Write a protein that binds this ligand. Structure first.
Ligand code: NI
Length: 60
């Protein structure tokens, strides 16, 4: 709930307004994981927020 972050495994570039662009290695908080495929994430590394593909991250 505040104890866990995820790490980005790969680079991803969004061309949609609601997806997050991020680089591998970024530290991400998962904000909304109600859906299995796409999670709302907040990057602590960039301060940006948006949906990410769930298979692009793993728990840190
Ligand atoms: Ni927590």
């Amino acid at each position: 709930g505040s104890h866990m972050t995820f790490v980005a495994l790969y680079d991803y570039e969004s061309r949609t307004e609601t997806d997050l662009s991020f680089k591998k290695g970024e530290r991400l908080q998962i904000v909304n994981n109600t859906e299995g495929d796409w999670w709302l994430a907040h990057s602590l590394t960039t301060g940006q927020t948006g949906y990410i593909p769930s298979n692009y991250v793993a728990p840190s």
